Amino acid sequence: PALAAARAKADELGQAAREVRASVERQTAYETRLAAQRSAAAFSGGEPPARREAPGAELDEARNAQTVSARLFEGNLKGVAQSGHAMSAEQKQALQSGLDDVFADAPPQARSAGAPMLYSANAAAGQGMADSDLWDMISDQIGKIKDNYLGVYENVVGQYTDFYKAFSDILSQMANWIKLNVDALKAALEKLKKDFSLGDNLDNKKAVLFPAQSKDGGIQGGSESDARKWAKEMGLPDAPPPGFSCVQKAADGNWVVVVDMTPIDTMIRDVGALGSGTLELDNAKFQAWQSGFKAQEENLKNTLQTLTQKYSNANSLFDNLVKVLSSTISSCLET
Amino acid sequence: PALAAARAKADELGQAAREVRASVERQTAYETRLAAQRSAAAFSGGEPPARREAPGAELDEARNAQTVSARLFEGNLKGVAQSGHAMSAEQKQALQSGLDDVFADAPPQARSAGAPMLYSANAAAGQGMADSDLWDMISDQIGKIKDNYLGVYENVVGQYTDFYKAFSDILSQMANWIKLNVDALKAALEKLKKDFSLGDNLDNKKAVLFPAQSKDGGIQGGSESDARKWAKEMGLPDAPPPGFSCVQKAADGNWVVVVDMTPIDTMIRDVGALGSGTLELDNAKFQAWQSGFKAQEENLKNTLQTLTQKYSNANSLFDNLVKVLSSTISSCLET
């Protein structure tokens, strides 16, 4: 019946997601190169340093078709539940086969997101669970999987890209600071540090990688446990005081995953012990630092791509998932 | 009956709003002075330029009690409708008296927000409108008034304060640029311009004063008419091409009210014709510009306070409104 209404949106979601993905995959790529051609320009006197975005603008017309097609689809699945369709036992085995491939060799924080759905699969597939109950638990998890797992990464990358975008903005201005304006350079890095780190009030949301943050609302962290789980999966340092850890407490009392500042923290210091003053550099210490600075640009660049790669994979999983739920739906409808 | 549940939240809203208000009224005040003590410090060699916020942080624990107490209250009013209370005709006259004082001598974009409610007032007050119908239209408008009118200003100021916050961040770095680093100074102003102006894609939301913008969603403007209506009320220039206007079209096709850039646009030029180069200034042109620059800081400062004052007033109106709806509710409950 309304299987068609579900199968239609299924594809719509599939597209919207893939576009968003490609949108983030494109912005990241552009930024990465822009940064490069801004640093080189800064040191190498040479060409000048600036940014123009193409339809590789993640948020825009992209992230929206994904949210609306996801909502509808989740609802439509609540409809497929209401009908009295009785999936041949040979189909449930397919939905169950499809769910496996989807969450088979995938990391830990992913299996946790695909556990409940995978439980329902084996449930009605060979133990005995009413279809209606199956479809619901499904319309339920697609949303939770999109919100908790896929939404996490999308926010993580978005939040991280704003930080990386602000960093590249400093390289552009660095051009006019270089023999050395160790002050303005060290002053900027300090600004990036402050702007993307919980403040003395632990209320700055711009520094939150997890969980997704409101726009005008207060900070909002989750249980200490949940913060660590994620910090780990996306490769961020958890190291206990006085060392550095991306897992920090907010004015919530709860926990958040913060932007890794060590790279900028290293730069904030290396640029320092070249100490101070607005400073004629030895052309041999200059290149002992320039390279000590570029070694950081590398790190930052690697985190952005890494987190970006973590995302696309997470996105490709959601896609394959919808695929399966679409193959099954189509199968049933074909009767 | 559930009049008590409505009267309780009524006060809760009253508080939450007043706190948010005082929160915005405090941040604005702090920033304004911080800016001052950052500019002076920049030119006058003197003291050094930086920011630490107190519970005058608008968004935080503030803007949240207001959203939740507003929701509940709006719902509770939907409850008062369901009961069979029959407001003496002497009360409706009071609710009607209270609504007048609230929207009496208040500006235009305000009467428009208090029109429907004021229509219901005269309606059941002396013409004949079923109470149930009255309470609903009321539970309806409190939300629309909070969203369309009060929410508009809260967003406007929030959006404007981020711009003004970024400007003051430039004054701090300007300190290390001053004889003159006309490049880094002119480079920053250019960055503030770009960061708070629709780009070549007309997709930058950080430059939107109206309407409220999503966080990760696409731009979203309203009808051309609606954009002008607001631009006017909050004192922003509407001037048609090639002049400058805060009313601009987005990648929506629709209309948005943008941050007034003229002040920074003037600075972007004055700092220029002191033209170029990273530049020994005559100590007499220096102070012919310093003062030409401070004359702008003034403007910016005046807009922030103005928009901030426009807000508090708008906030004080919402408050008085809730007051009235609370006086009436209490009156009925007292029977």
Automatic annotation (TrEMBL), chains A, B:
Bilayer-spanning residue ranges: none
Subcellular locations according to the entry: Secreted
Keyword set, alphabetical order: Coiled coil, Secreted, Virulence
Region feature Disordered, mapped onto this chain: 38-59
GO cellular component terms given for this protein: extracellular region
Chief location category: secreted
Keyword Transmembrane helix in record: no
Biased composition (Basic and acidic residues): 50-59
Origin superkingdom: Bacteria
Pfam families, A to Z: T3SS_TC
InterPro entries to which the protein is assigned, alphabetical: BipD-like_sf, IpaD/BipD/SipD
Function: Required for invasion of epithelial cells, as well as for survival within host cells, escape from endocytic vesicles and subsequent actin-tail formation. Probably regulates the secretion of effectors BipB and BipC and their final integration into the target cell membrane.
Family as reported in the entry's similarity comment: Belongs to the invasin protein D family.
Designated name of the protein: Translocator protein BipD
Species of provenance: Chromobacterium violaceum (strain ATCC 12472 / DSM 30191 / JCM 1249 / CCUG 213 / NBRC 12614 / NCIMB 9131 / NCTC 9757 / MK)
